[PDB]
Design an enzyme around this catalytic site. Structure first.
Site, PDB file in Angstrom:
ATOM      1  N   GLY B  28      24.909  69.703  79.224  1.00  0.00           N
ATOM      2  CA  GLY B  28      23.973  69.729  78.120  1.00  0.00           C
ATOM      3  C   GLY B  28      23.372  68.387  77.761  1.00  0.00           C
ATOM      4  O   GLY B  28      23.827  67.346  78.228  1.00  0.00           O
ATOM      5  N   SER B  72      18.357  63.481  82.544  1.00  0.00           N
ATOM      6  CA  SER B  72      17.458  63.870  83.611  1.00  0.00           C
ATOM      7  C   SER B  72      16.557  65.016  83.168  1.00  0.00           C
ATOM      8  O   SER B  72      15.508  65.273  83.786  1.00  0.00           O
ATOM      9  CB  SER B  72      18.261  64.296  84.837  1.00  0.00           C
ATOM     10  N   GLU B  73      16.958  65.696  82.091  1.00  0.00           N
ATOM     11  CA  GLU B  73      16.209  66.836  81.567  1.00  0.00           C
ATOM     12  C   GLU B  73      15.349  66.506  80.311  1.00  0.00           C
ATOM     13  O   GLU B  73      14.885  67.401  79.605  1.00  0.00           O
ATOM     14  CB  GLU B  73      17.195  67.986  81.269  1.00  0.00           C
ATOM     15  N   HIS B 155      19.047  78.913  85.051  1.00  0.00           N
ATOM     16  CA  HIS B 155      19.282  77.587  84.504  1.00  0.00           C
ATOM     17  C   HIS B 155      20.128  77.505  83.236  1.00  0.00           C
ATOM     18  O   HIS B 155      21.205  76.905  83.267  1.00  0.00           O
ATOM     19  CB  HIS B 155      17.894  76.915  84.276  1.00  0.00           C
TER      20      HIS B 155
HETATM   21 ZN   LIG Z   1      19.649  72.036  82.265  1.00  0.00          ZN
END
Ligand SMILES: [Zn+2]
Ligand SMILES: [Zn+2]
Ligand SMILES: [Zn+2]
Ligand SMILES: [Zn+2]
EC number: 4.1.2.17
Lengths: 206, 206, 206, 206
Positions: B28, B72-73, B155
C-alpha cells in the site's frame, strides 16, 4: 556478518513468519548461505525456545555439526542453494493457501501483476516425493531454475531470495496470490489472467 | 497542520492499515493533499522503518523532492487529487478481498446498505493498465468522478476522503463489502441486492 | 451498579467485540437496561476515543440526554428491551459471516447443537427495512419474541442477554454458527441438520 | 509434577488454544492424566478468570472434588484415557474448520502427508450423540482406538497425546488439515489424496 548475527535473523524470521500466519502446524524451516554450506533451524525445538546456539551449520558435503539435529527438511534447502547460486536465504513453510493450491497440483497463473516478483508469469507446483528424500530435492531444484518460489504438491512452499527479508517477503506474497487464486477459482474456472506480453512489461518494469 | 504532523499521520495510517490486514504483501501507499501537491510514502522503505523524514513531497508539476523516491504508484494519487477537489487523503492497497473481486473484474453491487458510504449504489472496477502509467491514471480519474473508492482490475483498491481517518475507514469498509460479495457469490449468483430507490433513501439519510 | 460502572462495561464490550473481530467497519453499538430506559454508545465517536462521559442515557419516552447524540441505531435497542423484558444488555454489529447469511436472507438451521443457546432450533433473519426506522424496529421485536439473537436482512446482527458478558458471548457464538453455515453451504445444499427432537433434548439439557 | 504445576499448564494451554483461535465460542476443555483419574478445567469459568485452584480432580470412579463443577464434557475425557492408556493429555474444542467437516460428517482423507501425525491415513468423524452422554463416550472411545484425534459429528474435535504441548500441537494441525480439506472441496470433489503406500512410508519415516 558474524554467525550469531545470521543466527538471530533466522530466528527473527521464524517469529515473524508465525506472526504473519505462514507458520501454522509449526512446520517451517529457514536457512541462510554461509561459508561452504548453510546455517539452518534445528528439528524438534519449537521456534519460541530457539536461541542462537541452536542454529545448525551443515557443510557442502551434507555433514552437520556434531550434537545438533538440523531440520528434517534440510536436503531441499541445500538443493535450492546449488540450483540458484544467487540465492542467499531460503524460507520453507506449509502456509494454508499455498498448500491448498499444491493439493490441487496446479501452478498459480498470472491473476495479479505481482506474480512477476517470483520471476515469471507463474508459481509452479513441483511433483510430490516423500519429504527428506533426494527425489524431492531434484523436483525442487528443477522448479527453482527459472523461478524464486515454488509450491510442492501435497506439501507446501519454498521461496528463495538474496536475504531473509526479501525471502520472507516473497513467501508472504505467494501466500496472498494463493489465497487470491483459491477465492476466485471457487467462483469461476478458469480464472481471468493477464497476457504474457503484459507480464513481459511488468518484468521489464520491475 | 505542520508538514511533520501530516507526515506522522500518514505513518500512523500505514501501521493501522497493516493492523487491520489491508496491507498484505506490503504494497500500500498513502498520501495527503499539501500545498500545491501532496505528501506521499516513499518507495522501498518497509513501513516499520518509516520516519517522518522519509515522507516525500511532490508538487503539482510532478517533481518530487531531491534525493527521495516517492511510491512507485504516486501518479494515480495525483490523479485522485485532480479528479476529486474535495479529496484530502488517499489510501491505496492490495487488500485480498478487494483484489479478488478486481480479478473477476466486477463492480460490487448494493448487497449491503453501507455501499452508500462510497457515494452510490456500487463500488466500480476500473480497467487494467500497467501500474505507474498515465493510462492507469486516466482509468482511475474516470472511476473516481462519482465515487470515493474504486477497485482496479487485477490490482487492488483506491479510496479517497476528507482526511486519513475517513479514508482508511472507507478502505476498510470496502474490504468488508468485498468479502461479503465473494462469500455470497460462491453460494449464489447473482447475489440479492437492495433496489436503487432503497439506496436513494439511505443516501439521503446519510 | 453505578452509571459509570455500566458505562465502563459498555466500553469494555466495544473493545472486546473489536478484539474478536465482530466490529469491522466500526458499526456496532451496545446498550444496557438502566432506570426507565437504557445507556447506549454515542454516534460518531470511534470506540478507542470513548470515555464513560460519552455514553448516552435515553429514557422510556425516547428522549436522550441534552447535548449527546446516541447511536443512529438506538431505536431497535429500545425495541429489544420492550420485546424482551428479561433482556438487560443488547449487542449489535455487522459481523461479516452473520451479514453474509443475512444477505442470502436465510435463517441459520440446527447444524450444530450450540444453536440452542439462542433459544431454539434456529437463528432467524428479520426482513429488511431502512435503518433507524420504526418499521425495522417492528421486524426486530417480532423476531426476538422467541429467540435471543436475530440476523437482519442486508444488515447484520442483534443479540440480547441478561448482561453484557453473555450478550457478547452469544453474538460471538452466532458469528461462529454463521461461518459454519456458509462454509458447508458452499459444499452442499441443503446442509445436514440435527432433528427437532434432538434440539428438544439439548434445550432441556441446557 | 505437582498438581499445581499440572494445573498451570492446563490453564496455559487454554490461553494458547484461544491465541491460536481454536477456542471460539469459548467451548473447549482440557485435561491431564493424574493419580487414578484426571485434572480437568471446570465448567462456567471463562478461561481468563481461571486460577490453579479452579482445576477439578475427578477420580477413576467418576466422582469429582467437592464444591467444584468439572467441565460439562468431562465424560469423554475419561473415555479417551481408558481407551488410550498411552494418552496423558486431552484437548477438546469446537474449532471452526474441524466442526464444519464434522457437520458434513466426513473423515479427513490423506490430502497432506502430515495426516500421519494422528496415526494413519485419516482423521475419522465419530457419529453424533448428545453431549455429556455415555453413548457419545462410546463413539469417541471406538474412534480413538487407532487414531489420536477424531472429529465428532455436529460438534467438534478431540485430540490426545503424551503431554499438553503435543496434544495442543495435534489439535492445531487437525484444524489446518480441516481448513485445507474444506478449501479444496469447494473447488473439486473428490479431493486428490496420497496413496496408502505413500502414507505407509511417511508413518515408518515419522
Ligand atoms: Zn498498487
Ligand atoms: Zn515441509
Ligand atoms: Zn447496524
Ligand atoms: Zn464440545
Amino acid at each position: 556478518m558474524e554467525r550469531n548475527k545470521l543466527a538471530r535473523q533466522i530466528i527473527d524470521t521464524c517469529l515473524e513468519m508465525t506472526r504473519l500466519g505462514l507458520n501454522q502446524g509449526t512446520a517451517g524451516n529457514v536457512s541462510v548461505r554461509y561459508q561452504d554450506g548453510m546455517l539452518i533451524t534445528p528439528t524438534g525445538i519449537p521456534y519460541e525456545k530457539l536461541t542462537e546456539s541452536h542454529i545448525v551449520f551443515i557443510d557442502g558435503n551434507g555433514k552437520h555439526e556434531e550434537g545438533k539435529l538440523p531440520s528434517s527438511e534440510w536436503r531441499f534447502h541445500m538443493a535450492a542453494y546449488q540450483s540458484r547460486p544467487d540465492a542467499n536465504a531460503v524460507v520453507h513453510n506449509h502456509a494454508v493457501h499455498c498448500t491448498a493450491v499444491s493439493i490441487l497440483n496446479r501452478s498459480i497463473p498470472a491473476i495479479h501483476y505481482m506474480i512477476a516478483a517470483a520471476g515469471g508469469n507463474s508459481i509452479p507446483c513441483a511433483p510430490y516425493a516423500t519429504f527428506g528424500t533426494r527425489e524431492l530435492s531434484e523436483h525442487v531444484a528443477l522448479a527453482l531454475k527459472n523461478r524464486k518460489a515454488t509450491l510442492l504438491q501435497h506439501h507446501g512452499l519454498i521461496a528463495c531470495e538474496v536475504n531473509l527479508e526479501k525471502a520472507l517477503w516473497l513467501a508472504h506474497e505467494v501466500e496472498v496470490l494463493a489465497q487470491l487464486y483459491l477465492t476466485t477459482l471457487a467462483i469461476t474456472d478458469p480464472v481471468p489472467v493477464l497476457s504474457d506480453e503484459e507480464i513481459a512489461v511488468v518484468l521489464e518494469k520491475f
